Amino acid sequence: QIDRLTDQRDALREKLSAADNFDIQVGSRIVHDALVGKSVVIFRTPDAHDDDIAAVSKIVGQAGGAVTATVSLTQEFVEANSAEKLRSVVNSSILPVDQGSQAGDLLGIALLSNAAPTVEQAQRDTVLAALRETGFITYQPIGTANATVVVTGGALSTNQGVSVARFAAALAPRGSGTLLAGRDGSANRPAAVAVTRADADMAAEISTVDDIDAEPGRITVILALHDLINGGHVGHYGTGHGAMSVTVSQ
Amino acid sequence: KRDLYTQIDRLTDQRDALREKLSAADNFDIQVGSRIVHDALVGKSVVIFRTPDAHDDDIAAVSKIVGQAGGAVTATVSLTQEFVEANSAEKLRSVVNSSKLVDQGSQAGDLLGIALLSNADPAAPTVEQAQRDTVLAALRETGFITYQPRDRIGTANATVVVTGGALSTDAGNQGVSVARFAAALAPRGSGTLLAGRDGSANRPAAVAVTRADADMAAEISTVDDIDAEPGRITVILALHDLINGGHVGHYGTGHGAMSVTVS
């Protein structure tokens, strides 16, 4: 059994490298004009992978778009042991109840352009500085964006999934499209992609990709984000539970 | 005992996840194929030749991708077992003389190229329908080819010769005659590509024969993995590079491939 499983695995690893090579090489052709003139802000959870975010950022650029910022959500933010703390330092009511919704509404007004009063640079910088000072976020490097991708890791062991799904759902009405993307395993509870797909309201509001660890998933983030911005069309993609198909049907 | 069971579980988990990633890449490739080949063969016509070991699904995927690229397929011509066995050169010569003993593949490639391809040069004579039909019927009557459709096959700009995968060592005659056939078609149109299934990059298969010969490798493009979606799409992209850029390339995952697809 061990011999057959290792020979099968070794041959599959070789075959997958050729498949990944093809998809990386033709990626720019697949995403051509998908995000022309559009800006995207990326949010990442603590379990998100650098390589997944770098591949998504690169494909946004190949699609004619631009990334305004990468904002990291800290362990303190996702662990929801500070809803009262968040409101005490900065809340969405100061700009022109659960932690996820409140932070999504606040960061959405601050970083996304409503499809509403324009948020000036100083108000945005004050909001970002307050959240960083209190341990909620870190960020690189900030202008306003049209759309957003919230990137997570894969499976969660054990309400971190809920707070991130509610965070993404609260960002959605503040811009032209929100996509929640996770790695393989994110389509299983209690991860955020699974929470989103199991709730009729959230699944009709934001798109999801469950396999951002693979090249088809990284490309699909851009294609599905294009469908959100241009067509107002939501979709759930990948290889896990609740995925309607590996990628956009059109 | 527990370590052996843990090894089996971990190996099963790795193999299962790789199978899922590979099936997803094939499905992803099918869904985005039209985007990749968008406008690649606009206003161009392609004639397909197939050997007995070629697969219907590989040819249907190529024909479909040609159409998604804005092109059209004029005809599918089957080369028979008598053709690939390349032991009827004298008999073929007696047919070529009613349309030096030249090798069967080369003679047939030159004749079918004149009949089915439009020469890249405007001053070359146009082959009228009756001359084309007479040539096709003489080769069908003597057991060299069959073709679809039977009536009104038009002229094409480019060609794809489709084969199966690996050949046995004793089938060297079949690899050689098909590589020579494809090489002889090349000067008669705007581009010829020889595409085979996984294993075709190993000798004595036609793709392998082409890649190991300096002259043929410089004259026609090759794809060695037409059984996979990357290979089917690459046929159209590499055909585009031949017709529009005069650039030859050797693609796929086997010996002599410069890369999986065009750059």
Numbering used by the authors:
A (entry chain A): 47 to 142, 152 to 170, 174 to 199, 203 to 219, 223 to 314
B (entry chain C): 41 to 139, 150 to 313
Provide the authors' own sentences about this structure as they appear in the paper.
D,L-endopeptidase RipA is the major PG hydrolase required for daughter cell separation in Mycobacterium tuberculosis ( Mtb ), as RipA defects severely hinder cell division and increase antibiotic vulnerability. Despite extensive studies, the mechanisms governing Mtb RipA regulation remain controversial and poorly understood. Here, we report an integrative structural and functional analysis of the SteAB system, a regulatory complex that has been shown to modulate cell separation in the model organism Corynebacterium glutamicum ( Cglu ) and is conserved across Mycobacteriales .
Although Mtb SteB was previously proposed to act as a mycobacterial outer membrane copper transporter, the crystal structures of the homodimeric protein, alone and in complex with the RipA coiled-coil (CC) domain, rule out this hypothesis. Instead, the high-affinity SteB-RipA interaction, together with computational and biophysical data, strongly supports the role of SteB as a direct RipA activator that releases enzyme autoinhibition upon complex formation.
